[PDB]
Each structure stands twice: as C-alpha cells, then as structure tokens.
C-alpha cells in the first residue's frame, strides 16, 4: 500500500508493468518518486503524463534530469536530442504538465514511518530542520513567475560546505547541488561534483555520502535514488538506495514499505 | 616516420603499446602530441616523464587539462581526486617536470608537411599570421615567473569573438579558449563554450569549427584532439581529429603522416 520507485526515466512501460505487478491502487495504495522521470529512456511523455494523473496518491522529489528539462523549456539550456525529451517538449500538453513538474516537492517526510526522501538523499552536513528549510526555499523559488531566473542561477559548483552564513547565489546552489546532484562527500561533510562511481572505484579521500554519519540518518530512513553507479549496494541500514539503472539497460526497483518487499522489473 | 596522437589522458600504459605497435624510433621517428598529457588515467607522472625525455623527438601542444594542472601545481585552481595527479603532484621532480610542460609551445607548425597542430584546433577567424601571434603571446605568459598570474586570469567563458582590438585579460581568455576549449562555432567564427556533444546530436546554428572555411584550413591540414565525443568521426579532407578518448571507453589512436595510416590501441 506504500511504494517507493526509483529514477524512471522515461521508462513508461516499465513503470506500469511493476505497478501491475505489485497491482497498484491510487485509491488504497501510495507512490513515492525518487523522481528522475523523464531522462535517457523512451516514454518520458507518457511518464510525465501518467504520474501527475495520481494526484495525491504521489509523492515526488525532483532530480538533476527534471531540473534540467525545466532548463531547456525555458530556453536555459539547449536540449541535448540523446536525452530523448523532444517528444515532451514538443507538444499541445507541456505547459500544463511542466508548470506541474516546477510545483513539485524537492524532499518529502513521513513522521509516521520515520521516512525521508530526496533525490540524491541528505548532507551529513545538514540536520532535518535545516534540510526541510532549504527545501522549501529552492521550491519556492522554482513555484515562481522568475523560476527561469533560479535555473540559471541554479548551475555553479563551488560552494561545498552549508555555512548558515551562506546566501544569495551560492546559498542556492549549494542546496541545488546537495538534493539534485550529490554522491561523494570529503571525510568531513563536503561535497565532490565530479566523480560517479562505485564506492570502491572512487580515488582516495572520497566516501559516500551515506558512509558519514549525521543527524537525520539517526531517526529517519532515508529513501533516495540518482546514484545509478552504486546499483542499490553496500549501504547500512535505514539507507536505501533504489535508482538501480533502469534506463541504462539496468532495472527498475519497487519497494513495498509495510513488509519491506522487493519487486523488480528488468529493461 | 612522423606519428601523430592525441590525447594521452595519463594512459601510459596504451602510448608505450602504440608506439611499440609502430617500432617508433626516437633516433628516426618524431611524434606529435595533441595535448591532455594528464588528465583522468592512471600514470599522467610516467606519461610526463617519457614525453619530457623525448626532447626534439616530440613535437607537444599544450591542452586544458594540462593547464588545469599547471593551476593546480601554482596553488591557482583546487585539485579534483577524478584527475588524479596526486602521485604526479607528490613527486621528488614535480618541479623539474611542470616547469617543462610550462615552457611547451600551443600550436606547432611544419612547412614541408603542410601540417598544423593545436589542441582544439584553429578559430575560422584566424589567419596563420595571427594564429603564432596568439600563440607566442600566450607561451611567453606561461613561460615567465608570473605565470600563476595568467593560469588565474583564463577562467571566462568570453571574449568569444576574434577582434585586433582586444587587450588585456579579454585577448589571453578568447585565444586560450580558442586553443583549448574550442569545438562549435557560429556562422561568423564565435565560440560557443557551453555545447561538448557530438555535431550529429546537437542543437542548431552551431557548426563544428572545422566545418566553417577558414584563411588556415584552406592552406593547411590541421591535426588537433581535444573534442572527444567527435569520436575521430566526421570531418573534412584534411583535418584530423585525433581524440577517441583513451581515458574513456575508447581508444588511442596514432597516425603516420606520410602513409595516412592508422594504428589503434584500445583502453
Ligand atoms: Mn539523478
Ligand atoms: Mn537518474
Ligand atoms: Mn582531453
Ligand atoms: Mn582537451
């Protein structure tokens, strides 16, 4: 009756086919989206399409990819035609549905099941009181008439350390960085923007992020999937890791939360 | 014989495979080197060692990533664990070796062969004239005792149009990044320095640089290897792109000039 995805990525047919399988129900039943949903991967119009027609019954965190997408339809960025978002961008329906898509939630809490979800999980750096803070202020920014303005202002790399003193561009884009595009931290609570990798593969002083103990990884779970290149692995636990890289001829992973039950949908 | 290869990310390992592969002969043979001596693999020390003792048998155009590192070794630019040159970095003739790479030229020029290396290539709004102008200008900065100085200075995306105008920290940045960052241009000669996948998968106005006729590429071929996802594919007679990215997944690729003829060492 609760489930947590994982990065989609354009990947309708298999998003439907686990929820069949696991016989999914908007009425009864809840879905949490780690939230890559439209990147490398077919269907990312008909993803987009299916998960806001939940309404309630969904419960999504924004990633690097939705982000990115938000970019080019505001002529931010340039689309790359590899990341196949062409047929979304296109057409009679993108406003609708990407006006939605800026509405929506970059972390997601659960007192009741102790649950935490965001996009690439939580900075040891930071407590829950100051993740929920920093989560409501890019959201309302990206909820705004000058979201275009944040996405610009969104794309840097070089603030590392949350310093409460930290404002203005690099405030936000510290915050951008730590939901949206986060995997290895230096021994301390810092934060490296360049490798993607197996733990065991990454060069020297980099740990994953999850292997540095804090605050809110001592009361709550933490749901959470970007890191592709980890596959769901040696993460302790209360920490789950559910992008196992659908799109890249991977998987698509589907946790019920109640009995803690694994479903799995291959490519 | 004259072998030409490009980018040699500290992939020792795959140079010393491909140079046996040839039998090349320091005493008869001369190599090119298309820059990018240091980036991702793991030996850019032993990949600095031999080409520096090559002396006039090499034939070297410095890349971004060679500069990066200078940046790093003057205290300039933060040291990235990806790159990995702390071995390099940490080594009893680190001195002895960045002070050479330093003093190594941006554009090499052979009369007989008709032939021209850079690291990205040439801008179609320059002339050869103007091109060794550039060149030296940029070689005597990096030569000189101040030379952290300008590795700090090149950092804008911008000047992006040639002009005999610019002065100052504007001119250093365009023919830097002209050299060494360049792939896309505009119709009219101008950079973009945003856009780094392939030409068949890209947004529009933006042609290859090559693609656009230019005062050198009329009267000379032009080796350069710095736009991997350029694949070695795609280009005009008489331009050579070099970079298949050995680094990567890819392969180095080495080519003998007066036979046209390709050797190739996978990673
Ligand atoms: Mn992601
Ligand atoms: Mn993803
Ligand atoms: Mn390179
Ligand atoms: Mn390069």
């Given at each position: 009756?609760?489930?947590?995805?994982?990065?989609v990525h354009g990947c309708y047919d298999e998003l439907i086919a686990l929820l069949h399988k696991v016989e999914f129900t908007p009425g009864k039943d809840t879905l949490w989206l780690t939230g890559d949903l439209?990147?490398?991967?077919?269907?990312?119009?008909?993803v987009l399409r299916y998960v806001k027609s939940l309404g309630d019954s969904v419960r999504l965190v924004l990633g690097n990819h939705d982000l990115h997408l938000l970019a080019v339809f505001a002529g931010i960025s340039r689309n790359k035609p590899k990341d196949r978002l062409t047929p979304l961008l296109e057409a009679p329906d993108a406003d609708e549905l990407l006006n939605w898509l800026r509405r929506q939630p970059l972390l997601q809490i659960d007192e009741e099941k102790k649950?935490?979800?965001?996009?690439?999980?939580?900075?040891?750096?930071?407590?829950?009181?100051?993740?929920?803070?920093?989560?409501?202020?890019?959201?309302?920014?990206?909820?705004?008439?000058?979201?275009?303005?944040?996405?610009?202002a969104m794309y840097g790399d070089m603030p590392n350390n949350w310093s409460p003193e930290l404002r203005g561009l690099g405030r936000l884009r510290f915050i951008t960085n730590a939901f949206?595009?986060?995997?290895?931290?230096?021994?301390?609570?810092?934060?490296?923007?360049?490798?993607?990798?197996?733990?065991?593969?990454?060069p020297a002083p980099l740990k994953p992020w999850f292997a540095i103990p804090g605050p809110v990884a001592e009361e709550y779970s933490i749901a959470f999937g970007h890191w592709a290149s980890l596959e769901g692995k040696?993460?302790?636990?209360?920490?789950?890791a559910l992008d196992t890289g659908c799109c890249w001829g991977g998987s698509l992973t589907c946790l019920r939360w109640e009995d803690k039950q694994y479903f799995v949908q291959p490519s």
């Open positions: 009756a609760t489930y947590l995805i994982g990065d439209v990147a490398r991967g077919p269907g990312s119009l008909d649950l935490v979800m965001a996009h690439a999980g939580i900075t040891p750096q930071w407590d829950l009181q100051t993740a929920k803070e920093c989560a409501r202020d890019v959201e309302a920014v990206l909820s705004s008439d000058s979201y275009p303005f944040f996405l610009d949206t595009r986060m995997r290895f931290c230096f021994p301390n609570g810092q934060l490296d923007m360049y490798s993607k990798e197996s733990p065991e593969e990454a040696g993460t302790p636990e209360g920490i789950y």
